[PDB]
């Protein structure tokens, strides 16, 4: 019924938007992967899964800021692989647990081919992870917007 980031900018129960300040790998290369492990940064939990039986999925993912420019990657949900930006529904991964579990998303952003110069400006938007919350208890199809902001600057080095 809720989702919270590591920085403390938590989304209220009804949904809403908050910032995800993500500490990145300051240099990644083409072929190598910028593994922005949001599984270690944004997490989600349910109020009581005994009757709610929540179903929490990544209904939307968008590339804004630095990632939109060069870094084109793939969203990994529970080990699977989907085209990021997430233009399709992702299969439900429940979080039938009161205790918080680390929201298994991981954007594998391998940058575009050789890109150019400096990429992913510090303090700039990385992505927008719009999460869907559903359950069999009611029709509370609730909206959780994470605006992923880069905490630091990656480079796509020349060579």
């Amino acid at each position, epitope marked *: 019924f809720a989702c919270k980031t590591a920085n403390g900018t938590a989304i209220p129960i009804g949904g809403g938007s908050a910032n995800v*300040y*993500v*500490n*990145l*790998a*300051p*240099a990644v*290369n*083409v*072929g*190598q992967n910028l593994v922005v*492990d949001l599984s*270690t*940064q944004i997490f989600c939990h349910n109020d009581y899964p005994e009757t709610i039986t929540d179903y929490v999925t990544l209904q939307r993912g968008a590339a804004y800021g630095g990632v939109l420019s060069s870094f084109s990657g793939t969203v990994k949900y529970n080990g699977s692989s989907y085209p990021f930006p997430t233009t399709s529904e992702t299969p439900r991964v429940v979080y039938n647990s009161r205790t918080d579990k680390p929201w298994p998303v991981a954007l594998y952003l391998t940058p575009v081919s050789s890109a150019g110069g*400096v990429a992913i400006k*510090a*303090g700039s938007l990385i992505a927008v992870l719009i999460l869907r919350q559903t359950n069999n208890y009611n029709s509370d199809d609730f909206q959780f917007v994470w605006n992923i902001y880069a*905490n*630091n*600057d990656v*480079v796509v*080095p*020349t*060579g």
Partner: antibody
Amino acid sequence: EVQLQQSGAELVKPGASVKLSCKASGYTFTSYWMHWVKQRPGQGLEWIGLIHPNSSSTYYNEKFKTRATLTVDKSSSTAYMQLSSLTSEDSAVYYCARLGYGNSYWYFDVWGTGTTVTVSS
Amino acid sequence: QIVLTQSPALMAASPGEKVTITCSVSSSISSSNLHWYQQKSETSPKPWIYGTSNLASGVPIRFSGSGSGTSYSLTISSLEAEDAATYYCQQWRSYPWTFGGGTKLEIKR
């Protein structure tokens, strides 16, 4: 612990590029990021740049663009530096390093031996 | 370029004294973006703090950075004599990656 070695304090005339070398074949170059920095006497450090051992891709500083050329030789795991137009403004100790993976951050986890570049005439 | 001004060059402490080596940044950078490196005199440097709060390998528990924004510190609970070295502040917010001018932490005897 596996470390990085470096050349001894070498002599270079003004206008001569050094061949400063940091090498270590015991920690598998195709795993880390192989950075370079510079420390002047009195004046503080100045980040020189980076090259990837896996693919020989470099990113330097604006103050060090067309100043230092950090190369990699991962087969022998050697890294040299080209310093054409080496003036006394570049007379400094020059250090090798690499980014580790400490938590979500990357940082100069292991340093080289260190080598003093003297550009006195 | 990112200006990074510290306590300019001078420091001094006894075996146990606190050293509040400040690191003022021209922009309010996040705690993720700051590093500290220890370089002993005529000796190779060592990573001392990465990410403003997480110490590197071999750095004792006495060192611990803090702060955010444009003010940055390296609070030391008990500085021993062996730690006498120049501590260079580094940013990795932007990519001049401008190191500091370095505070030569000497020893006050």
